[PDB]
Amino acid sequence: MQFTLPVRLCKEIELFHFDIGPFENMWPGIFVYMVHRSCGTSCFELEKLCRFIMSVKKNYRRVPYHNWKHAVTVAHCMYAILQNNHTLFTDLERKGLLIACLCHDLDHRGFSNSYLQKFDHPLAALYSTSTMEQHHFSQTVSILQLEGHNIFSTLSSSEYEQVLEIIRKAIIATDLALYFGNRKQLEEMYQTGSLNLNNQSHRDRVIGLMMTACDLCSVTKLWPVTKLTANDIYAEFWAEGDEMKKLGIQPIPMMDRDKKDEVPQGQLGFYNAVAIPCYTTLTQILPPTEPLLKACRDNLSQWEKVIRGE
Numbered sequence: 001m002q003f004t005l006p007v008r009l010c011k012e013i014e015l016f017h018f019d020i021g022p023f024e025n026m027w028p029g030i031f032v033y034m035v036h037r038s039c040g041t042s043c044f045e046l047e048k049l050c051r052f053i054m055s056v057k058k059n060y061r062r063v064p065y066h067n068w069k070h071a072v073t074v075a076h077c078m079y080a081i082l083q084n085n086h087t088l089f090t091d092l093e094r095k096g097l098l099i100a101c102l103c104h105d106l107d108h109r110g111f112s113n114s115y116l117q118k119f120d121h122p123l124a125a126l127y128s129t130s131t132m133e134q135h136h137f138s139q140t141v142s143i144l145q146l147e148g149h150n151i152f153s154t155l156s157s158s159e160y161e162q163v164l165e166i167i168r169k170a171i172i173a174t175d176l177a178l179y180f181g182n183r184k185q186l187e188e189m190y191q192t193g194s195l196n197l198n199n200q201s202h203r204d205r206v207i208g209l210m211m212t213a214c215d216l217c218s219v220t221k222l223w224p225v226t227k228l229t230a231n232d233i234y235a236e237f238w239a240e241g242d243e244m245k246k247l248g249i250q251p252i253p254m255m256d257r258d259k260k261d262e263v264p265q266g267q268l269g270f271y272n273a274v275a276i277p278c279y280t281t282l283t284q285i286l287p288p289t290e291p292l293l294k295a296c297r298d299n300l301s302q303w304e305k306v307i308r309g310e
């Protein structure tokens with residue numbers, strides 16, 4: 001609670017390319033700041049917000065990427081978006097989505113969904129698809145229910161089971177698998193013109209690309225930030241290969257450390273089939289979010305430079 005943000009950062013936070021990298025002591029305080037800026041200071045009672053942000057944090061684990069730094073970075077990109085699109089997302093929405101971004105990878109083990117299903121893993125036995133995603137939501141609801149943690153208490157029960165729904169939904173949308181379709185349908189509603197923010201399930205579709213665009217925002221940071229975030233990402237994937245190898249199974253080339261050489265090519269393919277389309281359809285639906293796609297291009301061409309050896 002006692003925290004105040006080094007007033008020097010007040011403008012640099014509102015950047016789409018801000019990097020929370022150097023400021024780890026401040027990561028819990030930043031989120032609060034981003035909450036306070038959006039839904040006001042007296043949105044949640046200050047005391048039950050700190051319990052919450054702090055429980056949440058402890059339930060992120062020591063893994064290379066799907067960690068506490070990751071989550072807060074996702075909450076940051078959602079912050080930026082919600083602000084650069086101020087009068088177009090309801091009171092409750094801005095409450096739901098920042099919490100959801102902060103929680104959308106709770107208790108992440110560091111292993112893919114495909115891993116947990118290839119090997120009949122207990123969580124995959126619980127959740128038949130979006131194995132972690134539903135667990136991330138399962139963790140979120142669980143932690144709300146702790147004595148003195150239910151920040152959504154003074155919402156009417158009805159608004160309270162709308163928050164949740166946004167949160168469950170927005171967390172499930174982070175399964176890339178679902179991303180591809182969700183973005184295709186949105187590319188058609190735009191072409192067609194039949195996309196209508198009044199209709200609830202178009203918003204849910206837009207929220208989901210908003211969730212994806214946040215999830216991938218490390219691709220939208222400054223090149224020396226992004227280059228050193230990628231190391232975090234593969235570190236994990238290559239662990240997930242190291243376990244696939246230990247059984248005498250060849251991992252996919254994405255998760256194989258023996259092919260570190262091929263990563264520049266691999267990154268570049270990723271931006272062209274995932275990142276760039278995501279921020280393109282997003283910028284078509286939320287024009288102010290063009291800085292993400294602008295920095296996504298910039299970063300992409302950096303990998304092209306590294307492929308071409310410059």
Ligand SMILES: Cc1ccc2c(c1)nc(CCc1coc3ccc(Cl)cc3c1=O)n2-c1ccccc1
Pocket residue numbers: 215216217218219233253254259262263265266267269270273274
């Ligand atoms: C040898 C090799 C072959 C394929 C490769 C690769 C290396 N690296 C990749 C990309 C790996 C990858 C996967 O998920 C992400 C999620 C979020 C963010 Cl910010 C970045 C990534 C990311 O970099 N692919 C890949 C390419 C296209 C689609 C999917 C993965």
Ligand SMILES: [Mg+2]
Pocket residue numbers: 104105108132133174175
């Ligand atoms: Mg996840």
Ligand SMILES: [Zn+2]
Pocket residue numbers: 070074104105174215
């Ligand atoms: Zn994520």
